[PDB]
């Protein structure tokens, strides 16, 4: 349903602007991921 | 009772929460359970 | 009933022991080469990744995939998409399959190349399907997933050849030997004290005559009958790499005589 | 990381028999020599393909996400 973040404790698709330091819902973890890409990337297969 | 300082802490003596963990905890706490760690973070 | 004759030892559904005689070491020689680089397979050579929260990496699995047998018995109809003119791939020229696994028990996950679900129109042609010969019919493991870890894919397979890449290669594995007794000469063997003791000995002995103690060397023999063994990895039934290697072969110096033609 | 999808030497396919392979090991108590060439891996580049491998992926699926 669209993020930008992601905490790597319960992978919460988060997400939030400006003036929110770092941090997810209960998991006070301050380091987040960003999520993934949504235009899929195509491998050779060799 | 006054606080000075912080120690650096090796990775795997006493302190270093990794000193007692098993191996299903070291997983957990994203750590390999092969380092030996004898290192500063 | 003409030059180059055969003689089968052995047959299977992978394996085809076999004897060539009155033919040179040329020909015998290229169709070994033909078999293991230029026989047309089919073969992942694209993959386009929706999820991946496995542990391997995209590359990999991928590398993988493209390495999975597929059937191509009746690739000789499938067209090479280079060929084609449509805009990149179709079902002309292409199979598409795709492979969605999700990590649904907690007792790990296995994905196999059965997962693999062509979505193209086969057009009643026997290609793309991934091979098995497993006993338990899993063709290949892929990937593992754990708890709640996902991988979608799909992959487009197109007709290849060996030299390309090694994927497209049908042939496994080829014996070959001629002159099981070294009567010919093509060999100077390193002994260590006697020779004939330290050097084993090839079955194909068996099948020819021995040297005897005092003949001196026959200066015009040359190398005639080969002793070979055709692997298969299935893609392609035994007899037929044999079969299509010859044809390649046979094809390819046909090329060159419309080529002189031409010109 | 996962058994290796063919022999690199010649191309046996040899993705299909990991696991046929650790249970002739383990239920059939047989010598990795026998197993091996049960499970038709007569050559040793094929051999050594099944035989020397680690799987590693069993212990990258112990992290937990
Ligand atoms: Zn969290
Ligand atoms: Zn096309
Ligand atoms: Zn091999």
Same mark, same amino acid.
């Given at each position: ?46 | 009772?006054? @606080? ?29 359970? @092969?380092?030996?760690?004898?290192? @500063?973070? | 009933?003409?030059?180059?004759? #055969? ?47 496995? #542990?391997?990496? !995209? ?19 499938? $067209? ?32 196999? &190349? ?5 979505? &193209? ?28 870890? $996902? ?43 006697? &020779? ?42 035994? !007899? ?24 | ?65």
């Amino acid at each position: 349903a669209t993020l930008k973040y992601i905490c790597a404790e319960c992978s919460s698709k988060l997400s939030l602007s400006r003036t929110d330091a770092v941090r997810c819902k209960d998991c006070g973890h301050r380091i987040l991921l960003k999520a993934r890409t949504k235009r899929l990337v195509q491998f050779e297969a060799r | 009772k006054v @606080f000075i300082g912080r120690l650096p802490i090796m990775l795997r003596s006493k302190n270093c929460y990794l000193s007692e963990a098993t191996e299903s905890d070291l997983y957990k706490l994203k750590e390999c359970p @092969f380092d030996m760690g004898g290192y @500063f973070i | 009933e003409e030059g180059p004759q #055969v003689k089968i030892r052995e047959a299977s559904k992978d394996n085809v022991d076999f004897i060539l005689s009155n033919v040179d070491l040329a020909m015998a020689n290229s169709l070994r080469r033909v078999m293991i680089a230029e026989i047309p397979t089919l073969a992942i050579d694209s993959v386009e990744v929706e999820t991946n929260t496995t #542990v391997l990496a !995209d590359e990999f699995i991928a590398h993988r995939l493209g390495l999975i047998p597929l059937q191509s018995m009746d690739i000789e109809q499938l $067209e090479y998409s280079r060929d084609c003119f449509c805009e990149d791939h179709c079902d002309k020229c292409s199979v598409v399959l795709t492979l969605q696994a999700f990590g649904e028990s907690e007792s790990t996950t296995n994905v196999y &190349s059965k997962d693999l679900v062509i979505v &193209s129109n086969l057009m009643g042609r026997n290609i793309g399907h991934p091979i098995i010969q497993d006993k338990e019919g899993n063709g290949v493991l892929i990937c593992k997933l754990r708890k709640g870890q $996902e991988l979608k894919l799909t992959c487009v397979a197109k007709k290849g050849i060996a030299k390309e890449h090694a994927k497209w290669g049908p042939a496994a594995a080829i014996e070959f030997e001629y002159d099981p007794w070294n009567k010919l000469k093509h060999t100077d063997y390193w002994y260590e004290q006697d &020779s004939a003791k330290e050097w084993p000995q090839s079955k194909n002995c068996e099948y020819e005559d021995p040297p005897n103690e005092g003949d001196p060397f026959d200066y015009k023999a040359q190398a005639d009958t080969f002793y070979m063994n055709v692997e298969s990895v299935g893609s392609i039934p035994v !007899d037929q790499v044999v079969v299509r290697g010859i044809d390649t072969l046979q094809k390819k110096v046909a090329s060159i005589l419309l080529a002189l033609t031409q010109m | 990381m996962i058994v290796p999808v063919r022999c690199f030497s010649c191309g046996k396919v040899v993705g299909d028999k990991w696991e046929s392979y650790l249970n002739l090991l383990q239920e059939d108590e047989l010598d990795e020599g026998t197993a091996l060439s049960r499970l038709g891996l007569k050559r040793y580049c094929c051999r050594r393909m099944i035989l020397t491998h680690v799987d590693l992926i069993e212990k990258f699926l112990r992290y937990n996400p």
